[PDB]
Amino acid sequence: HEVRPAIGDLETEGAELSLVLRLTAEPLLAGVDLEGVEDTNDTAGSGAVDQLRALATADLMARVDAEQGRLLGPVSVTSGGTAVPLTLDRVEVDDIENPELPRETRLFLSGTLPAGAETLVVTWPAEYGTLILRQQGVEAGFTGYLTGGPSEPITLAGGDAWSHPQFE
Ligand SMILES: [Cu+2]
Ligand SMILES: [Zn+2]
Ligand SMILES: [Zn+2]
Ligand SMILES: [Zn+2]
């Protein structure tokens, strides 16, 4: 199965953080090192991915809800060096019966930023492959190509994050 970048949509509405991950769950659950992987068929866990592909959409979801600790452990948001713990609120899985096609899984993550937050850093592990982190709800917002370790700092919208320059 061709490996595509995960896509992450990050939005803040004051202190409320949403991160929505568009991803392929099957490699992440099988434990496959996705770093420099173009196709899961060229990895040792190919059969493990393909067994996971065979499950119904409801089974895949409950397995994602059941293993969130392992899956989300190395995914972190910090803001001013304070950890911003993420909750898994919701899980979608596309229903594609053709087993030779990958299906998208979406994770809906939320947290609360500290009072007065101005920047956050997202950390994604190299083992999970590329993440294209897009900041939503802002003109000329942050884009990042996360291949392992911390993002560059993401500048936040909203009243708390504003700074008045010393002169106009
Ligand atoms: Cu395959
Ligand atoms: Zn590695
Ligand atoms: Zn939906
Ligand atoms: Zn909004």
Residue numbers in the entry: 1 to 168
What did the publication describing this PDB structure actually write?
We report the method of signal strapping, where sequences of N-terminal signal peptides artificially appended with a histidine residue at their C-terminus are used to bootstrap a proteomic search. These searches return sequences of proteins with an N-terminal histidine capable of coordinating a metal ion. We exemplify the approach by the discovery and characterisation of four classes of bacterial metalloproteins, including two that we denote as anglerases reflecting their potential to capture transition metal ions from the bacterial environment. Structural and spectroscopic analyses confirmed that these proteins bind transition metals (Cu²⁺ or Ni²⁺) via N-terminal histidines.
The search revealed that the query protein contains two separate domains: a non-cytoplasmic domain containing the N-terminal histidine (hereafter termed Ang-1), and a C-terminal transmembrane (TM) HupE/UreJ-2 domain. The Ang-1 domain of the HupE/UreJ-2 protein from R. bacterium (hereafter RbAng-1a), excluding its transmembrane (TM) region, was cloned for recombinant expression in E. coli. Based on these results, RbAng-1a is designated a Cu-metalloprotein, though Ni²⁺ binding is also significant. Dissociation constants (Kd) determined by TSA were 73.6 ± 2.3 nM for Cu²⁺ and 220 ± 10 nM for Ni²⁺, suggesting physiological relevance for both ions. RbAng-1a was crystallised in the presence of Cu2+ and its structure resolved to 1.9 Å using molecular replacement with an AlphaFold2 (AF231) model. The copper-binding site of RbAng-1a lies on a flat surface, where Cu⁺ is coordinated by the N-terminal His1 and the O atom of Asn41 in a T-shaped geometry. This coordination motif has been reported as a ‘mono-histidine brace’. The RbAng-1a Cu-ligand bond lengths range from 2.1 to 2.7 Å, and the copper ion is three-coordinate. The geometry suggests a Cu+ oxidation state, following photoreduction of Cu2+ in the X-ray beam. The resulting spin-Hamiltonian parameters of g3 = 2.28 and A3 = 525 MHz and superhyperfine couplings from two Cu-N interactions AN = 35, 42 MHz are consistent with Cu2+-RbAng-1a binding Cu2+ in a T-shaped coordination from the protein-based ligands (N2O coordinating atoms), augmented by a coordinating ligand, likely an exogenous water molecule.
